[model samples]
Target: GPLGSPEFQVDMTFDVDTANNYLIISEDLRSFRSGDLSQNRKEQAERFDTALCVLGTPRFTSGRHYWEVDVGTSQVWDVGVCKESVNRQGKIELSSEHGFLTVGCREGKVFAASTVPMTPLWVSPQLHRVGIFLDVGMRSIAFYNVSDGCHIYTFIEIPVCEPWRPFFAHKRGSQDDQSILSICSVIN
Candidate 1:
Protein backbone atom coordinates (compact mmCIF):
# COMPACT_ATOMS: atom_id res chain seq x y z
CA GLY A 1 0.00 0.00 0.00
CA PRO A 2 1.12 3.55 -0.69
CA LEU A 3 0.12 4.91 2.71
CA GLY A 4 -0.48 8.28 1.11
CA SER A 5 -4.18 8.53 1.82
CA PRO A 6 -5.92 11.90 1.69
CA GLU A 7 -6.75 11.63 5.38
CA PHE A 8 -3.05 11.64 6.33
CA GLN A 9 -1.76 14.28 3.94
CA VAL A 10 -0.52 17.60 5.34
CA ASP A 11 0.33 20.89 3.73
CA MET A 12 3.85 21.68 4.88
CA THR A 13 5.64 25.02 5.10
CA PHE A 14 8.96 26.25 6.38
CA ASP A 15 9.23 28.00 9.76
CA VAL A 16 11.31 31.11 9.14
CA ASP A 17 11.65 31.73 12.87
CA THR A 18 13.80 28.61 13.26
CA ALA A 19 15.81 28.96 10.06
CA ASN A 20 19.54 29.50 10.17
CA ASN A 21 21.28 32.57 8.79
CA TYR A 22 22.64 30.63 5.84
CA LEU A 23 19.16 29.51 4.80
CA ILE A 24 16.93 31.56 2.50
CA ILE A 25 13.24 30.77 2.84
CA SER A 26 10.87 31.65 0.03
CA GLU A 27 8.20 34.31 0.59
CA ASP A 28 5.42 31.75 0.27
CA LEU A 29 7.23 29.65 2.89
CA ARG A 30 7.07 26.51 0.75
CA SER A 31 10.74 26.33 -0.29
CA PHE A 32 14.18 27.11 1.09
CA ARG A 33 17.80 27.10 -0.09
CA SER A 34 21.31 27.65 1.16
CA GLY A 35 22.63 31.12 0.51
CA ASP A 36 26.19 32.33 -0.08
CA LEU A 37 26.32 34.74 2.83
CA SER A 38 24.71 34.68 6.21
CA GLN A 39 21.81 37.01 6.91
CA ASN A 40 22.03 39.79 9.51
CA ARG A 41 19.08 38.55 11.52
CA LYS A 42 18.76 38.97 15.25
CA GLU A 43 20.13 36.09 17.30
CA GLN A 44 17.50 33.95 18.93
CA ALA A 45 17.72 31.06 21.35
CA GLU A 46 15.59 28.85 19.11
CA ARG A 47 17.23 29.80 15.83
CA PHE A 48 19.78 27.46 14.29
CA ASP A 49 23.37 28.71 14.35
CA THR A 50 25.67 25.87 13.37
CA ALA A 51 23.45 23.84 11.07
CA LEU A 52 21.95 25.08 7.82
CA CYS A 53 18.57 23.64 8.71
CA VAL A 54 14.95 24.76 9.21
CA LEU A 55 11.87 23.33 10.83
CA GLY A 56 8.38 23.34 9.35
CA THR A 57 5.34 24.96 10.97
CA PRO A 58 3.13 21.90 11.47
CA ARG A 59 3.55 20.00 14.71
CA PHE A 60 2.32 16.46 15.27
CA THR A 61 1.75 14.57 18.50
CA SER A 62 -0.61 11.86 17.35
CA GLY A 63 -2.03 10.13 14.30
CA ARG A 64 -0.48 9.51 10.90
CA HIS A 65 0.95 12.42 8.93
CA TYR A 66 2.31 12.43 5.37
CA TRP A 67 4.13 15.09 3.37
CA GLU A 68 6.20 15.27 0.23
CA VAL A 69 9.30 17.34 -0.59
CA ASP A 70 10.71 18.39 -3.94
CA VAL A 71 14.49 18.11 -3.95
CA GLY A 72 15.06 20.07 -7.07
CA THR A 73 18.56 19.53 -8.41
CA SER A 74 19.99 19.44 -4.92
CA GLN A 75 22.77 16.90 -4.60
CA VAL A 76 22.95 17.42 -0.87
CA TRP A 77 19.73 17.80 1.07
CA ASP A 78 17.85 16.41 4.06
CA VAL A 79 14.14 16.03 4.88
CA GLY A 80 12.43 14.50 7.86
CA VAL A 81 11.13 15.34 11.37
CA CYS A 82 12.45 16.20 14.79
CA LYS A 83 11.22 16.84 18.30
CA GLU A 84 9.76 20.24 19.19
CA SER A 85 12.53 21.08 21.66
CA VAL A 86 15.47 20.06 19.44
CA ASN A 87 18.74 21.83 20.14
CA ARG A 88 19.38 24.65 17.71
CA GLN A 89 22.64 26.22 18.89
CA GLY A 90 24.94 23.28 18.20
CA LYS A 91 25.87 21.29 15.10
CA ILE A 92 22.72 19.29 14.58
CA GLU A 93 23.14 15.52 14.14
CA LEU A 94 20.42 13.58 12.39
CA SER A 95 19.51 10.63 14.54
CA SER A 96 16.70 9.34 16.74
CA GLU A 97 18.77 9.91 19.87
CA HIS A 98 19.16 13.59 18.96
CA GLY A 99 15.42 13.91 18.38
CA PHE A 100 15.74 13.68 14.58
CA LEU A 101 14.63 11.01 12.12
CA THR A 102 15.73 11.93 8.62
CA VAL A 103 16.96 10.55 5.28
CA GLY A 104 19.23 12.55 3.05
CA CYS A 105 21.46 12.48 -0.01
CA ARG A 106 25.14 13.29 0.42
CA GLU A 107 28.04 12.68 -1.93
CA GLY A 108 25.60 11.18 -4.41
CA LYS A 109 24.32 8.56 -2.01
CA VAL A 110 20.94 8.33 -0.29
CA PHE A 111 20.89 7.15 3.29
CA ALA A 112 18.81 7.18 6.45
CA ALA A 113 20.29 9.41 9.14
CA SER A 114 19.13 7.56 12.23
CA THR A 115 21.78 4.85 12.47
CA VAL A 116 25.28 5.12 13.87
CA PRO A 117 27.01 4.16 10.62
CA MET A 118 24.28 5.92 8.62
CA THR A 119 22.41 3.22 6.75
CA PRO A 120 22.86 3.49 3.00
CA LEU A 121 19.91 3.36 0.57
CA TRP A 122 19.66 2.41 -3.06
CA VAL A 123 17.30 4.42 -5.28
CA SER A 124 17.95 4.15 -8.99
CA PRO A 125 17.46 7.06 -11.42
CA GLN A 126 18.01 9.49 -8.55
CA LEU A 127 15.35 10.82 -6.21
CA HIS A 128 13.46 13.86 -7.43
CA ARG A 129 10.64 13.83 -4.93
CA VAL A 130 10.51 12.25 -1.48
CA GLY A 131 7.43 11.20 0.49
CA ILE A 132 7.61 10.93 4.24
CA PHE A 133 5.03 9.07 6.28
CA LEU A 134 4.96 9.29 10.05
CA ASP A 135 2.84 6.81 11.94
CA VAL A 136 2.77 8.11 15.49
CA GLY A 137 0.70 5.31 16.93
CA MET A 138 3.03 2.71 15.48
CA ARG A 139 6.13 4.75 16.29
CA SER A 140 7.41 4.34 12.77
CA ILE A 141 8.64 6.68 10.06
CA ALA A 142 8.92 5.62 6.44
CA PHE A 143 10.37 7.22 3.34
CA TYR A 144 9.20 6.79 -0.24
CA ASN A 145 10.30 7.71 -3.74
CA VAL A 146 7.31 9.54 -5.11
CA SER A 147 8.15 9.11 -8.79
CA ASP A 148 8.01 5.31 -8.78
CA GLY A 149 6.22 4.83 -5.47
CA CYS A 150 9.10 2.72 -4.19
CA HIS A 151 9.67 2.24 -0.48
CA ILE A 152 13.06 3.59 0.59
CA TYR A 153 13.44 2.90 4.25
CA THR A 154 11.65 2.94 7.59
CA PHE A 155 12.60 3.53 11.21
CA ILE A 156 10.48 1.66 13.73
CA GLU A 157 9.97 2.08 17.48
CA ILE A 158 11.18 5.65 17.48
CA PRO A 159 11.33 7.01 21.02
CA VAL A 160 9.57 10.25 20.30
CA CYS A 161 7.15 11.35 23.02
CA GLU A 162 7.03 15.11 22.47
CA PRO A 163 5.56 17.00 19.58
CA TRP A 164 7.40 16.65 16.25
CA ARG A 165 8.08 19.28 13.60
CA PRO A 166 9.11 18.73 9.99
CA PHE A 167 12.88 19.13 9.47
CA PHE A 168 14.86 20.26 6.41
CA ALA A 169 18.51 20.93 5.63
CA HIS A 170 20.38 22.20 2.56
CA LYS A 171 24.13 22.05 2.31
CA ARG A 172 25.95 25.33 1.76
CA GLY A 173 28.05 25.23 -1.37
CA SER A 174 29.72 27.39 -4.00
CA GLN A 175 27.95 30.10 -5.97
CA ASP A 176 27.36 27.72 -8.86
CA ASP A 177 25.26 25.45 -6.68
CA GLN A 178 21.65 26.61 -6.76
CA SER A 179 19.69 23.81 -5.21
CA ILE A 180 16.36 24.32 -3.48
CA LEU A 181 14.04 22.17 -1.35
CA SER A 182 10.34 22.75 -1.69
CA ILE A 183 7.33 21.36 0.16
CA CYS A 184 4.76 19.94 -2.23
CA SER A 185 1.16 20.93 -1.56
CA VAL A 186 -1.46 18.23 -1.10
CA ILE A 187 -4.37 18.88 -3.45
CA ASN A 188 -6.90 17.14 -1.24
Candidate 2:
Protein backbone atom coordinates (compact mmCIF):
# COMPACT_ATOMS: atom_id res chain seq x y z
CA GLY A 1 0.00 0.00 0.00
CA PRO A 2 0.98 3.66 -0.39
CA LEU A 3 1.88 4.27 3.25
CA GLY A 4 4.42 7.00 2.73
CA SER A 5 2.04 9.96 2.45
CA PRO A 6 0.03 11.34 5.37
CA GLU A 7 -3.73 11.87 5.20
CA PHE A 8 -5.37 15.28 5.03
CA GLN A 9 -8.78 16.45 6.39
CA VAL A 10 -11.40 18.98 5.35
CA ASP A 11 -14.32 20.97 6.88
CA MET A 12 -16.26 24.24 6.52
CA THR A 13 -15.34 26.46 9.42
CA PHE A 14 -14.93 30.15 8.60
CA ASP A 15 -14.00 32.39 5.65
CA VAL A 16 -10.29 32.97 6.35
CA ASP A 17 -9.46 35.81 8.73
CA THR A 18 -9.86 35.16 12.44
CA ALA A 19 -11.95 38.28 13.15
CA ASN A 20 -14.21 37.39 10.20
CA ASN A 21 -14.62 33.72 11.16
CA TYR A 22 -17.94 32.52 12.62
CA LEU A 23 -20.23 29.43 12.72
CA ILE A 24 -23.99 30.14 13.06
CA ILE A 25 -23.84 33.45 11.12
CA SER A 26 -26.63 35.63 12.55
CA GLU A 27 -25.81 38.08 15.37
CA ASP A 28 -28.53 36.78 17.70
CA LEU A 29 -26.69 33.98 19.49
CA ARG A 30 -29.12 34.15 22.40
CA SER A 31 -31.80 32.41 20.28
CA PHE A 32 -29.80 29.22 19.71
CA ARG A 33 -28.68 28.09 23.16
CA SER A 34 -30.02 26.34 26.28
CA GLY A 35 -28.57 28.69 28.84
CA ASP A 36 -25.52 27.08 30.64
CA LEU A 37 -25.27 24.30 28.06
CA SER A 38 -25.65 20.59 28.91
CA GLN A 39 -23.59 17.43 28.54
CA ASN A 40 -24.65 17.03 24.93
CA ARG A 41 -23.07 20.29 23.81
CA LYS A 42 -19.88 19.40 25.60
CA GLU A 43 -19.51 15.96 24.02
CA GLN A 44 -20.88 16.75 20.55
CA ALA A 45 -18.32 19.51 20.12
CA GLU A 46 -15.67 16.82 20.24
CA ARG A 47 -17.46 14.58 17.75
CA PHE A 48 -18.47 17.43 15.42
CA ASP A 49 -14.89 18.46 15.33
CA THR A 50 -14.12 14.95 14.16
CA ALA A 51 -17.03 14.58 11.69
CA LEU A 52 -16.02 17.81 9.97
CA CYS A 53 -12.50 16.47 9.72
CA VAL A 54 -13.48 15.21 6.25
CA LEU A 55 -15.57 18.09 4.92
CA GLY A 56 -13.82 21.18 3.49
CA THR A 57 -11.49 23.71 5.14
CA PRO A 58 -11.21 24.78 8.76
CA ARG A 59 -12.53 28.32 9.34
CA PHE A 60 -14.07 28.51 12.80
CA THR A 61 -14.84 26.16 15.65
CA SER A 62 -18.39 27.22 16.71
CA GLY A 63 -18.46 30.87 15.77
CA ARG A 64 -21.51 31.97 13.75
CA HIS A 65 -20.76 32.71 10.13
CA TYR A 66 -22.80 35.48 8.46
CA TRP A 67 -22.90 33.63 5.10
CA GLU A 68 -24.83 30.75 6.66
CA VAL A 69 -27.94 32.71 7.54
CA ASP A 70 -27.23 35.39 5.00
CA VAL A 71 -30.38 34.61 3.01
CA GLY A 72 -32.24 34.91 6.34
CA THR A 73 -35.92 34.18 6.61
CA SER A 74 -38.34 36.87 5.56
CA GLN A 75 -41.72 35.35 6.34
CA VAL A 76 -42.84 33.50 9.46
CA TRP A 77 -42.72 29.89 8.20
CA ASP A 78 -40.56 30.21 5.18
CA VAL A 79 -38.24 27.20 4.55
CA GLY A 80 -34.72 28.32 3.83
CA VAL A 81 -31.16 27.72 5.02
CA CYS A 82 -29.31 30.13 7.28
CA LYS A 83 -26.58 30.51 4.65
CA GLU A 84 -25.48 30.25 1.03
CA SER A 85 -23.37 27.24 2.07
CA VAL A 86 -23.62 25.69 5.55
CA ASN A 87 -20.74 24.09 7.39
CA ARG A 88 -21.66 20.77 8.96
CA GLN A 89 -19.56 21.46 12.03
CA GLY A 90 -22.17 19.35 13.84
CA LYS A 91 -24.03 19.99 17.15
CA ILE A 92 -25.39 18.02 20.13
CA GLU A 93 -28.41 18.63 22.39
CA LEU A 94 -29.33 18.09 26.07
CA SER A 95 -32.85 16.79 25.43
CA SER A 96 -35.25 15.91 22.63
CA GLU A 97 -36.61 19.45 22.71
CA HIS A 98 -34.45 21.39 25.08
CA GLY A 99 -31.92 22.86 22.65
CA PHE A 100 -33.66 24.41 19.68
CA LEU A 101 -31.94 26.44 16.91
CA THR A 102 -33.11 29.48 14.98
CA VAL A 103 -31.45 30.79 11.83
CA GLY A 104 -32.12 33.56 9.32
CA CYS A 105 -30.28 34.91 6.28
CA ARG A 106 -31.46 38.48 6.70
CA GLU A 107 -28.60 38.98 9.21
CA GLY A 108 -31.07 40.91 11.42
CA LYS A 109 -34.04 38.59 11.89
CA VAL A 110 -33.78 35.08 13.39
CA PHE A 111 -36.37 32.31 12.91
CA ALA A 112 -35.71 30.12 15.92
CA ALA A 113 -35.79 26.35 15.27
CA SER A 114 -33.86 23.41 16.78
CA THR A 115 -31.26 20.74 16.08
CA VAL A 116 -33.82 18.26 17.44
CA PRO A 117 -36.82 19.26 15.31
CA MET A 118 -34.34 20.49 12.70
CA THR A 119 -35.29 17.69 10.28
CA PRO A 120 -33.33 17.24 7.10
CA LEU A 121 -36.59 16.63 5.28
CA TRP A 122 -39.33 19.01 4.09
CA VAL A 123 -41.09 18.77 7.49
CA SER A 124 -41.45 16.70 10.63
CA PRO A 125 -42.92 16.49 14.14
CA GLN A 126 -40.13 14.92 16.21
CA LEU A 127 -36.57 15.54 17.43
CA HIS A 128 -33.07 14.04 17.54
CA ARG A 129 -31.11 12.87 14.49
CA VAL A 130 -32.99 15.25 12.19
CA GLY A 131 -30.54 14.30 9.43
CA ILE A 132 -30.06 17.97 8.51
CA PHE A 133 -27.77 17.99 5.48
CA LEU A 134 -27.42 19.92 2.25
CA ASP A 135 -27.89 18.33 -1.15
CA VAL A 136 -24.92 17.17 -3.25
CA GLY A 137 -24.50 20.57 -4.87
CA MET A 138 -25.37 22.22 -1.56
CA ARG A 139 -27.79 24.42 -3.52
CA SER A 140 -30.84 23.37 -1.46
CA ILE A 141 -31.46 21.64 1.86
CA ALA A 142 -32.49 18.00 2.10
CA PHE A 143 -32.83 15.18 4.60
CA TYR A 144 -29.75 13.09 5.38
CA ASN A 145 -31.72 10.13 4.08
CA VAL A 146 -34.89 9.31 2.13
CA SER A 147 -36.82 6.44 3.77
CA ASP A 148 -36.27 7.62 7.33
CA GLY A 149 -35.67 11.17 6.19
CA CYS A 150 -38.57 12.57 8.22
CA HIS A 151 -37.82 12.33 11.96
CA ILE A 152 -41.33 13.29 13.10
CA TYR A 153 -42.80 10.70 10.74
CA THR A 154 -40.56 7.85 11.90
CA PHE A 155 -41.12 8.54 15.59
CA ILE A 156 -44.88 8.87 16.05
CA GLU A 157 -44.82 9.53 19.83
CA ILE A 158 -41.76 11.74 19.36
CA PRO A 159 -43.99 14.73 18.75
CA VAL A 160 -45.69 13.95 22.07
CA CYS A 161 -42.83 12.98 24.45
CA GLU A 162 -41.00 16.07 23.24
CA PRO A 163 -43.39 18.79 22.30
CA TRP A 164 -42.31 21.63 20.04
CA ARG A 165 -40.83 24.21 22.40
CA PRO A 166 -38.86 26.94 20.66
CA PHE A 167 -35.37 27.91 21.96
CA PHE A 168 -32.88 30.72 21.22
CA ALA A 169 -29.10 30.12 21.02
CA HIS A 170 -27.04 31.92 23.67
CA LYS A 171 -23.48 32.58 22.60
CA ARG A 172 -20.92 32.82 25.39
CA GLY A 173 -17.35 31.70 26.11
CA SER A 174 -17.35 28.05 24.90
CA GLN A 175 -21.05 27.69 24.04
CA ASP A 176 -20.67 28.69 20.39
CA ASP A 177 -22.42 27.63 17.15
CA GLN A 178 -20.99 24.15 16.52
CA SER A 179 -21.35 23.34 20.20
CA ILE A 180 -25.16 23.61 20.00
CA LEU A 181 -25.45 21.24 17.03
CA SER A 182 -27.05 18.41 19.09
CA ILE A 183 -28.67 17.52 22.48
CA CYS A 184 -28.48 15.15 25.45
CA SER A 185 -31.12 15.41 28.31
CA VAL A 186 -34.02 17.69 29.35
CA ILE A 187 -34.77 20.56 31.77
CA ASN A 188 -35.55 17.98 34.46
* Residue 48 local lDDT, model 2: 34
Off by over 4 Å in 1: 1-4
Clashing pairs in 1: none
Per-residue lDDT over 92-130 for candidate 2, one digit per residue giving the tens place of the 0 to 100 score: 232334322332111223323334644333432222232
lDDT string for model 1 (1-188, tens) is 25546888887788888899988888899988888788867789768988888898988998999999988788788888889988899888887788888888886565556666688787866678998998999999889988888988898898767988998988845688877899988673
How many Å off is the CA of 106 in candidate 1?
Answer: 0.8
Instruction: Please tell me which predicted candidate would have the highest lDDT against the true structure.
Output: 1
Clashes of each: 0, 51
Where in model 2 is the C-alpha error above 4 Å?
Answer: 1-32, 36-81, 84-124, 136-138, 144-147, 151-188
CA lDDT, every model vs. true structure: 0.83, 0.25
